[PDB]
Write an enzyme that holds these catalytic residues in place. Structure first.
Site, PDB file in Angstrom:
ATOM      1  N   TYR A  36      42.019  37.458  41.947  1.00  0.00           N
ATOM      2  CA  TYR A  36      42.256  37.143  43.352  1.00  0.00           C
ATOM      3  C   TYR A  36      41.499  35.923  43.855  1.00  0.00           C
ATOM      4  O   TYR A  36      42.102  35.003  44.408  1.00  0.00           O
ATOM      5  CB  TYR A  36      41.843  38.344  44.190  1.00  0.00           C
ATOM      6  CG  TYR A  36      42.831  39.457  44.210  1.00  0.00           C
ATOM      7  CD1 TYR A  36      44.186  39.207  44.092  1.00  0.00           C
ATOM      8  CD2 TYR A  36      42.406  40.763  44.303  1.00  0.00           C
ATOM      9  CE1 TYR A  36      45.091  40.231  44.116  1.00  0.00           C
ATOM     10  CE2 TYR A  36      43.299  41.791  44.312  1.00  0.00           C
ATOM     11  CZ  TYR A  36      44.635  41.521  44.222  1.00  0.00           C
ATOM     12  OH  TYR A  36      45.515  42.565  44.235  1.00  0.00           O
ATOM     13  N   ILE A  37      40.183  35.920  43.691  1.00  0.00           N
ATOM     14  CA  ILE A  37      39.287  35.006  44.382  1.00  0.00           C
ATOM     15  C   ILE A  37      39.137  33.701  43.609  1.00  0.00           C
ATOM     16  O   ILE A  37      39.473  33.607  42.429  1.00  0.00           O
ATOM     17  CB  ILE A  37      37.937  35.694  44.595  1.00  0.00           C
ATOM     18  CG1 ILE A  37      37.393  36.150  43.255  1.00  0.00           C
ATOM     19  CG2 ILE A  37      38.118  36.901  45.444  1.00  0.00           C
ATOM     20  CD1 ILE A  37      36.029  36.743  43.334  1.00  0.00           C
TER      21      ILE A  37
END
Lengths: 65, 646, 81, 81, 81
Positions: free
Chosen positions: C77-78
């Site tokens: 995600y990040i």
DNA sequence: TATATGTATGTGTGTATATATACACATATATATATATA
DNA sequence: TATATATATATGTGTATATATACACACATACATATACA
């Protein structure tokens, strides 16, 4: 253009490279017109190359030694 | 068994990562929301957002808001429930033991205080709950927006449609792409991917814009979550139930697939202007208008991702992996790991998904053993890549094993001067990978495959190499004496030249009976010791799965005593032992037809080569063929025209 | 590897893609999970974090004070730059 | 307490990731080996190698060799006793 | 009731129980009775054990020693450049 | 008392969605457990 | 109230592994529900 290019051997190499491109242009216009469709011998050659690469990969347990 | 093992496993009071609202189940319980997120990183985002104490004085907080995790993808109940008819004239809906024991749904039933035998028609029943509304904070990508939100709607429709009537199921609405102009202080927010693609194709100079893809909602920065939580009630929506919705909930999530085949041919209907203004103004959503856009767009996307193209033979992920492998190993063909090459092909080919599935795809694209999916793999695998016996499920971890580009096969099959002249896929503006490769050979019928998908099934069995070479040399070469005959056969859709299954690296035998081929393994018998020696299994049969399958049939266990495996790394050798005086009982008890032997009927030693030729076509969409000749005859003109334009 | 990776233009990447880069070009001979954990924790910035002057700018959800940075996103995600 | 020591905490079964030899605990029990490996990819290598059937007549096989996994890092007993 | 970057914890006492804390949790000069009660101080206890160039441990006794060991390297690196 | 006959489960393949767990290493702090005093 | 145990938590950089869901369809195993009877 670099000043290395202005020598006589570089002129000679450019002349023969122009000759090779002229011969290749003649071959391209010669095999654009062939039967049944354009590029019919080239695809036979690629058939042969893929087939012998498949054979040489099967002989080496797909490791290509 | 549970009571035996409760001293180590006590009642989990996590209720699936549930956070209590300070007012859940009290006097103001109907003033409360339940922000059901999808994972744990989403809960990190939501707990960051609900604690802006004085940077968001008009926002929500934990006084009237809870959190819970949906656990990934919701189970559906429409395929796991039975309507049974009793004597009085009423069909009661009784569940399954698998659906009853699902830990995620047990969590939300215990949190919300739902009851299965209630109906919640009156408001006196609709005030006995513990929250006021369930609010699905899900991702905005097509998987999370379509699939698990449709399954959550399908669950609530199948058990309590009166709450979808009376405004109980809600959702947020987040961006999927933000674009930042240089200079200006407002970004452009797109909610669907094709909207951004149609936008970005219209531009002429995208040299100073920064496109941001937000995969999950936990990728949202601090100023972005502040500007999304200043406008929280501005962006919550509510579902309204139609009367035409029962047919759409039965089509998309019911146990009948042919409704889903008949629907999902045509693309998604675009959304009108009156419906757009009504949705954005009165701030409510009809369920049917959701199921015919989001869920249908998801199911078309899943067909695109999970079913091969009939030209190159590979799916979307394997095409990205081949393009990134040609780009990576260009300088020198030096080995990489699996996770490092996966990081490369996720960076440069704009892959927008997880890493574990990409690394599994690279591993199974590199494997090569007797009975693997690929007969001509893209890569050379270096390390432990699994064997026949566990079906290739016994490889190494991706930090151990390596891949390398099979450089001369990739060079000959996929020529480099042809790849300049192909239609490409654009992600976020930049080129990533082709729409398809056009190989020198029809590679879609040269390998194996067995997948499910949405609506359709994929299953192929590979053809002989020599048959395919004879067919293409009959088409192309004009000095071949089967040239114009084969042209007549292409004109009038008949067959001349045979097309057999591939028996390479297989030591049993193939027989064509009626309309299908069967594959047979080899035994070897000896009555002097009551020993049968299995020396060959049928095509694509794992060894340990076969041996554990023969041990569960007690009709066969009454005749054998001991079963011992003496297999090699790539060669089968199985040894049974018979209890004395039981061969004649096998012969008279497991009868012999002329299609299979008694010993093969006893030892499970044939299977049918049954195909499901369902591919995707260029410019999107399913295509379904009947025989492999149709796939070859569809393949040839693309390669012909590609030679002309090069 | 981060000075060399973001050399041309400083576009952000996922944590697992940058981890594959730094395990390829810096000859990291270990597992991949602990490298991604170090890339996550080498970019966090909150009251009470380890690094007061982090090497990277972190783009996404990187955990908070209230769990000690143990509630960041997955590397799927990040992002970092 | 007897039913707490027993009943609930009664007899169990065999452990995971264990491949016994054909001659374990028998008349030629002493001449068998236990090739204890570190994880499961190592056991995949050992299963690949102990099944060289006729390509290695001088090598071992499962007639006198077994396999078990060490679970990562062993607990030390020199400071929990 | 804390935000994502600022602590705000709220306790609630049993009725008439502020008085009984002071005799139970005695106030020294170093900490208050509430800070004894609510676990509201800690000691900053350092272990300045580093590794040095060419490997091996090094162990300092104060931060001044680390600064005085650091300065000449930057000095000679300026002379080299 | 054998026979069918319509029910219900059950793994399995590729490409997706979301998570879980054991171990080593040092040192400061902790909360309940324990003698024997009596 | 005292001296004394034995187990217990948390930090960074390391070593190993586990598991839930969707999607299609040919195939395998489990009754069971009758219908002649017997």
């Amino acid at each position: 253009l670099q000043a290395r290019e202005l020598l006589i051997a570089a002129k000679t190499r450019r002349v023969e490279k122009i000759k090779k491109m002229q011969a290749r242009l003649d071959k391209v216009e010669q095999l654009l017109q062939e039967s049944p469709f354009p590029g019919a011998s080239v695809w036979l050659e690629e058939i042969d190359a893929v087939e012998k690469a498949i054979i040489k990969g099967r002989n080496t347990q797909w490791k290509f030694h | 068994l549970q009571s035996i093992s409760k001293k180590d496993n006590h009642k989990q009071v996590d209720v699936d990562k549930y956070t209590r609202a300070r007012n859940a189940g009290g006097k103001r319980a109907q003033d409360c929301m339940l922000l059901a997120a999808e994972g744990d990183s989403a809960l990190s985002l939501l707990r960051t957002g609900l604690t802006l104490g004085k940077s968001n004085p008009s926002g929500p907080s934990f006084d009237f808001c809870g959190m819970i995790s949906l656990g990934g993808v919701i189970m559906n109940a429409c395929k796991k429930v039975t309507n049974i008819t009793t004597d009085s004239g009423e069909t009661i809906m009784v569940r399954n033991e698998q659906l009853t024991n699902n830990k995620v749904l047990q969590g939300i039933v215990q949190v919300l205080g739902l009851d299965f035998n209630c109906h919640y028609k009156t408001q006196e029943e609709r005030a006995k709950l513990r929250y006021g509304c369930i609010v699905a904070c899900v991702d905005q990508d097509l998987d999370g927006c379509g699939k698990i939100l449709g399954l959550l709607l399908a669950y609530f429709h199948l058990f309590w449609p009166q709450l979808i009537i009376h405004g109980f199921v809600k959702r947020l609405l987040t961006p999927l792409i933000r674009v930042y102009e240089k200079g200006k202080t407002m970004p452009v927010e797109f909610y669907y991917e094709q909207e951004f693609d149609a936008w970005a194709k219209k531009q002429t100079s995208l040299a100073n814009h920064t496109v941001k893809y937000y995969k999950g909602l936990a990728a949202h920065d601090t100023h972005e979550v502040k500007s999304m939580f200043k406008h929280f009630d501005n962006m919550v929506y509510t579902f309204t139930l139609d009367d035409s919705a029962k047919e759409l909930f039965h089509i998309y999530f019911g146990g009948e697939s042919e409704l889903r085949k008949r629907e999902l041919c045509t693309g998604v209907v675009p959304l009108t202007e009156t419906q757009t203004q009504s949705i954005h103004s009165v701030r409510r959503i009809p369920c049917s208008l959701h199921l015919q856009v989001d869920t249908k767009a998801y199911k078309l996307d899943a067909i695109e991702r999970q079913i091969p193209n009939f030209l190159d033979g590979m799916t979307r992920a394997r095409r990205k992996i081949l393009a990134g492998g040609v780009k990576c190993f260009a300088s020198n063909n030096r080995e990489r790991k699996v996770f490092q090459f996966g990081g490369y092909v996720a960076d440069h080919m704009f892959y927008h998904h997880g890493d574990m599935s990409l690394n599994t795809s690279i591993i199974k694209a590199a494997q090569y053993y007797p009975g693997s999916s690929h007969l001509y793999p893209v890569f050379i695998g270096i390390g432990s890549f699994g064997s026949r016996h566990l079906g290739g499920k016994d490889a190494g971890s991706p930090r151990y094993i390596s891949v390398q580009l099979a450089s001369e096969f990739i060079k000959t099959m996929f020529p480099a001067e042809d790849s300049w002249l192909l239609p490409y896929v654009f992600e976020d503006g930049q080129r990533a990978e082709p729409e398809y490769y056009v190989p020198v050979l029809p590679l879609a019928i040269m390998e194996y495959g067995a997948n499910p998908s949405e609506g359709w099934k994929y299953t192929t069995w590979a053809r002989q190499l020599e048959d395919i070479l004879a067919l293409v040399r009959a088409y192309v070469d004009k000095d071949n004496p089967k040239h114009e005959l084969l042209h007549y056969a292409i004109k009038h859709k008949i067959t001349i030249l045979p097309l057999r299954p591939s028996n390479y690296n297989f030591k049993g035998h193939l027989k064509r009976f009626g309309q299908y081929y069967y594959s047979y393994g080899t035994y070897v018998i000896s009555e002097q010791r009551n020993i049968i020696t299995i020396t060959e299994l049928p095509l694509r049969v794992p060894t340990v799965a076969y041996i554990e399958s023969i041990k569960k049939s007690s009709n066969r266990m009454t005749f054998i005593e001991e079963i011992i495996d003496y297999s090699s790394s790539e060669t089968i050798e199985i040894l049974v032992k018979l209890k004395p005086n039981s061969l004649n009982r096998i012969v008279e008890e497991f009868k012999e037809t002329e299609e299979q032997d008694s010993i093969e009927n006893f030892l499970r030693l044939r299977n049918c080569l049954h195909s499901h030729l369902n591919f995707v076509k260029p410019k999107g969409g399913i295509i379904e063929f009947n025989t492999y000749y149709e796939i070859l005859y569809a393949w040839l003109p693309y390669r012909r025209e590609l030679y002309q334009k090069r």
